[PDB]
Amino acid sequence: GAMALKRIQKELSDLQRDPPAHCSAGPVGDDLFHWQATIMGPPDSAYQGGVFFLTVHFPTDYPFKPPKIAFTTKIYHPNINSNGSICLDILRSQWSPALTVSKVLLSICSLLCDPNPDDPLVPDIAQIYKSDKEKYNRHAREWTQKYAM
């Protein structure tokens, strides 16, 4: 009766019937509590042409607690660090059972198009972003070609 299983199965079925643009998700391994997700960098972002792999790990009391979502693909972005951790409100404080992995994936896409420099996980990138956007995009593009293509 502690089963997050039904909620996960329902989300999976809903997401796969109506997937967020630029995104894909499916179960991975034996673990029903693990999904892999994929994000194709949006056209109007420094990450276009790039393919980013993410892990989705559901806690055992999901959806009372948010899913653990992390990039496995290396990325140059103020809100994502070298461990692939994502600084995003709805993955922490602003989570609620009303949200979904689908909605989080959409927000990550939004974050790729419009980094939030006021929420730096990576200080020096956040300022290259605010100080010189043109060099930021240059670096973001270079890292996409190098690690996400």
Binding site: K6, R7, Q9, K10, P63, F64, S96, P97, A98
Partner: protein, 67 residues
């Protein structure tokens, strides 16, 4: 025919937002969102929809209930 899509969307709308297994039968007061069974509702201190504080949970018999 494709009434199936409509009837199933309706049935799934009646399922608890959290456990996705039990029929919804509880409203958060004072905000009025009605999205959970009694057990999941009792465990949420703020409304999942509007984030309003939950002062108390009121049992509701959904007018759309079968048996």
């Amino acid at each position: 025919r494709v009434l199936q899509e409509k009837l199933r969307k309706l049935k799934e709308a009646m399922l608890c937002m959290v456990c996705c297994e039990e029929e919804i039968n509880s409203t958060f007061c004072p905000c009025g969102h009605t999205v959970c069974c009694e057990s999941c509702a009792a465990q949420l201190q703020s409304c999942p929809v509007c984030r309003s504080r939950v002062e108390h949970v009121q049992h509701v018999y959904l007018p759309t209930h079968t048996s």
